[PDB]
Design an enzyme around this catalytic site. Sequence first.
Site, PDB file in Angstrom:
ATOM      1  N   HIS A 118       0.870  -1.215   0.000  1.00 25.20           N
ATOM      2  CA  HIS A 118       0.000   0.000   0.000  1.00 25.20           C
ATOM      3  C   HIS A 118       0.888   1.241   0.000  1.00 25.20           C
ATOM      4  O   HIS A 118       0.971   1.979   0.961  1.00 25.20           O
ATOM      5  CB  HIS A 118      -0.892  -0.084   1.246  1.00 25.20           C
ATOM      6  CG  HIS A 118      -0.079  -0.088   2.513  1.00 25.20           C
ATOM      7  ND1 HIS A 118       0.433  -1.255   3.057  1.00 25.20           N
ATOM      8  CD2 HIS A 118       0.267   0.912   3.388  1.00 25.20           C
ATOM      9  CE1 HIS A 118       1.046  -0.928   4.209  1.00 25.20           C
ATOM     10  NE2 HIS A 118       0.975   0.377   4.457  1.00 25.20           N
ATOM     11  N   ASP A 144      -0.345  -7.886   1.376  1.00 25.80           N
ATOM     12  CA  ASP A 144       0.062  -6.456   1.206  1.00 25.80           C
ATOM     13  C   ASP A 144       1.573  -6.331   1.380  1.00 25.80           C
ATOM     14  O   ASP A 144       2.054  -5.604   2.229  1.00 25.80           O
ATOM     15  CB  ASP A 144      -0.682  -5.665   2.289  1.00 25.80           C
ATOM     16  CG  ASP A 144      -0.599  -4.170   1.977  1.00 25.80           C
ATOM     17  OD1 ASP A 144       0.497  -3.634   2.030  1.00 25.80           O
ATOM     18  OD2 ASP A 144      -1.629  -3.585   1.688  1.00 25.80           O
ATOM     19  N   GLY A 188       4.401   7.381   6.121  1.00 26.58           N
ATOM     20  CA  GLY A 188       5.629   7.015   5.358  1.00 26.58           C
ATOM     21  C   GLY A 188       6.514   6.115   6.224  1.00 26.58           C
ATOM     22  O   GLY A 188       7.493   5.564   5.756  1.00 26.58           O
ATOM     23  N   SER A 191       5.569   3.335   7.283  1.00 25.54           N
ATOM     24  CA  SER A 191       5.227   1.946   6.868  1.00 25.54           C
ATOM     25  C   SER A 191       6.277   1.453   5.877  1.00 25.54           C
ATOM     26  O   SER A 191       6.872   2.237   5.160  1.00 25.54           O
ATOM     27  CB  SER A 191       3.844   2.064   6.212  1.00 25.54           C
ATOM     28  OG  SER A 191       3.504   3.438   6.046  1.00 25.54           O
TER      29      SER A 191
END
Length: 165
Positions: free
Chosen positions: A36, A60, A116, A118
Site C-alpha cells: 500500500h 500487502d 511514510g 510503513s
Amino acid sequence: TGRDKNQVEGEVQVVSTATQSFLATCVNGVCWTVYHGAGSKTLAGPKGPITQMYTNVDQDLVGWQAPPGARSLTPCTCGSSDLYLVTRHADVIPVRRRGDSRGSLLSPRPVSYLKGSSGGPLLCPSGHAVGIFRAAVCTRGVAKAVDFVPVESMETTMRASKKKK
Ligand SMILES: [Zn+2]
C-alpha cells in the site's frame, strides 16, 4: 533487472513511488516494502527506478531482488519481542511485538508523523529484521499500536517468485 548501482550498505532504504514515499527493509537479500504505497513498482533504487520481483497482495507486501545494493538484515524469529522501528528518516522507538502482524509502540505519537513510516522494520534487540510496519493504530490522533508484515511471508517468495506458469 533494475538499476541497482552505487553501494547501498543500508538496512532500510527510503523510496518514492508514483503514489507516495515510505520505507523498504532489506531481508535475506530481498528488499521488502509495503504494497500500500508501491502499487505499480517503479520506485527509486540507489539512483534509478527499480522493478519489483514479487508481490504478496493477499498479505500487502512486495519483495525486490536486493543483492550488491543492500546490507540485508537477519530474519531470526527471536523469542524476545523488544523490537525497534525507524520512521522515514529515523525515530528510533522500541515496540513490543503483540503478534506476527502487531507491535505495541512504547511511545505513542501522532499517526501523521508515522506517514511514510510503513515499509520500515521492527528490529530485534540484536539487529534482526522480523517485521515491516504496514499500518498504524491511531486512537484519538496518535498510533497506540503498529501493525506490520511478517518476515515468514518473505520466505514464501524465496521458495518461489510467484511461479504463475
Ligand atoms: Zn531476531
